[PDB]
Amino acid sequence: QDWLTFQKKHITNTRDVDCDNIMSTNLFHCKDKNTFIYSRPEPVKAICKGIIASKNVLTTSEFYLSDCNVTSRPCKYKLKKSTNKFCVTCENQAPVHFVGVGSC
Questions:
Q1: I need a labelling partner for 74 at 20 to 30 A (CA). Which of 14, 50, 68, 92 fits?
Q2: Strand (E) positions, the chain?
Q3: What is the CATH number of domain 2-104?
Q4: How far apart are CA 51 and CA 48, in angstroms?
């Protein structure tokens, strides 16, 4: 919804996210999936530089991604690490929503 919450929800300081811990907090509330970007914030924010009106954008570069994907057991997750481009919603020069991996 804004850059601060995008960072809380999607930027990680470790590739090896502890899915079964973080996914069970109220922010994620055991949802089926979340993608985290292992990056300093500035390379991520730069994706949206100059973009004002909300527009979905596919990264030029690839990033280290860490997906928490629910297993057959409720609120228990497999961590799946990948290198890919991703699509964000850019608004006023910062990512405000994570759209999806690989494509807009």
A1: 14
A2: 11-12, 33-38, 55-58, 63-70, 77-84, 86-91, 94-101
A3: 3.10.130.10
A4: 6
Among 6, 10, 36, 59, the active-site one is 10
Tokens read off for 9: 């929800």
What does residue 98 show for φ and ψ, rounded to 5 degrees?
-95, 125
Q: How was this structure determined?
A: X-ray
Could you give the CA distance from residue 69 to residue 23 in angstroms, rounded to a whole number?
10
Q: Give the residue carrying structure tokens 């020069």.
A: 93
For the chain, what are the domain ranges?
2-104
Q: How far apart are CA 53 and CA 46, in angstroms?
A: 16
Backbone angles phi, psi at 6, to 5 degrees: -60, -40
